[PDB]
Symmetry: D2
Subunit: 114 residues, 4 copies
């Protein structure tokens, strides 16, 4: 799997379970094609989110539904979503991990690329 996510909760000190997200690929005319969706497990991950055939070179957007996560926790969130947009160059089985650290009014995101 060339695309992994890891989400943590900065209020409780746990991975962020049950976060919904969607992966889209940018189209020529500027639109977006949905290619996968999922919900993180209790470790804040989605295993085998997409396949290598689904992940050609191009621009991708991963949209994380952080608002619902905080609503469930009882907190009042600021953001509607966390968005991560990047150009993928997957040749050579290059792998992408998107890490995300959530607070109700803040998030930190980083990427680890092999």
């Amino acid at each position: 799997c060339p695309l992994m996510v890891k989400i943590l909760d900065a209020v409780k000190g746990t991975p962020a379970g049950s976060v919904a997200l969607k992966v889209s690929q940018k189209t020529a005319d500027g639109g977006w094609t949905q290619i996968a969706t999922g919900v993180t497990d209790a470790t804040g991950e989605i295993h085998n989110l997409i396949t290598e055939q689904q992940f050609p070179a191009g621009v991708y957007r991963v949209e994380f539904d952080t608002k619902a996560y905080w609503t469930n926790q009882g907190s009042t969130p600021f953001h509607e979503v966390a968005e991560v947009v990047f150009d993928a160059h997957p040749e050579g089985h290059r792998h992408y991990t998107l890490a995300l650290l959530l607070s109700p009014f803040s998030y930190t995101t980083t990427a680890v690329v092999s």
Copy 2:
């Protein structure tokens, strides 16, 4: 002015000057209308980005062109853009400051709401 930004550079310890951004409001059908553009000054700020008349409650997006910023700093960036998407509740002259801390492969964003 109800919407401010403050952008900092985590590599060199200075505000991020000359960062372009676009502000959009979400429409009822789920699309986006651009309502303003600007470029940060050398303090990492944009004064008078929008007016209170342009800022009813709703969903807003600020798109920061961080890729062009890192290219101009001379460091290869990961993100194609940094998008901050948030719910506005201006009732009562509430002001919003979007703070953004930039590194080539990471950013932290938070908000200060008066």
Copy 3:
């Protein structure tokens, strides 16, 4: 004043008021001399923390009592304290601002150096 702080609360989207801190300079033998204390105001700042006369070049530590802050907010914290330790090069009226973004199990710290 050559040393400023700005503390924000990532849970509620406001400055962190009433955060106690202690400033120390490192001695030649590797110990620490306390040179100032303060408490943040409701803007998350401490004015006139030290003077230029108290700020030669060297190694400084700012110890932020974040555990007492989170206890008073009513959220269980992870860290016993947040310590920021840095090299000062004041030659030329260089000013230092320590920015600190707090969550119960995380913090982000950066600096803006004039």
Copy 4:
């Protein structure tokens, strides 16, 4: 192993290899007892850093030598070290992971506690 670390590099988008650190336990009179040291591998980790017998309930400090890491990379760092101080309650094989995201003038740290 009850204590793990994970260090990432926000400039290059890789784990932070070859970072030296030391683990100390707080003493009654306020001092510190060194209990382990190590250097991260290429995945930004130190496997089996300490044993459960070495990790009684108490306050611990993990000091990461970030200055040397940035000097090696050619960057000019702000901080001397990154310090993480916390009270450990290891009963029930409770585990602690200290995560750390480094930039030359900034770091984010968080903890995951099982």
